[PDB]
Amino acid sequence: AACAVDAGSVDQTVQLGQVRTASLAQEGATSSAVGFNIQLNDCDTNVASKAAVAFLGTAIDAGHTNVLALQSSAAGSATNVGVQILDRTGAALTLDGATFSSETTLNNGTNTIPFQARYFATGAATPGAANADATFKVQYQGGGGGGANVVEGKFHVTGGNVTTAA
């Protein structure tokens, strides 16, 4: 409660564009990264000096706990690729709702915590839609153990497509 999550951040979406299978041909290949942020308003640094964000979603498998599984689709979604959420240090965050981003240091009032989303291949990707969803929670570093916003934010990736094309 040191801050409030901006309503525009509480339910938001990133679109990653179109990716070639040739660009996701082996584990660890990545698509281009697109930025987003979590905006906090009305921050009171009497209460908290720093904020961080954790993300929860279904991971693609046990060996890739920081890769978000894609939603199924009638036409067949891409396989061997999911979505990563990168914090300000470039690290992809484990999607267990308990692995927090590095901290953003706050001023009073409005602050933005920067992130990126990208596709990450776990193998040789195959073509199809590549949409994903996650939830997020904001935690503060402040007195008495800090605090947390009671809101559960929603993050979405839509408009994504993996194709086999030149």
Alpha helices in the chain (DSSP H): 7-10
**CATH number of the domain within which 126 lies:** 2.60.40.1090
State which residues form the domain around 157: 4-163
Experimental method: X-ray
Contact status, residue 127 vs residue 41, Cβ threshold 8 Å: no
Q: What is the DSSP string of 111-145?
A: EEEEEEEEEEEEEEEE-EE--EEEEEEEEEEEGGG
Q: What is the largest CA-CA distance in the chain?
A: 56
Domain count for the chain, please give it: 1
User: 72-92 burial, b if ≥16 CB within 10 A, otherwise e?
Assistant: eeeeebbbbbbbbbbbeeeeb
* Resolution of this structure in Å: 1.5
- From residue 16, give the alpha-carbon distance in Å to each of 102, 141, 158: 23, 32, 8
Q: Which two tokens stand for residue 140?
A: 């503060």
Amino acid 110 reads T
Give the Cα separation of 99 and 142 in Å (integer).
18
Give dist(CA 85, CA 156) in Å, integer: 11
Tokens representing 139 are: 């935690």
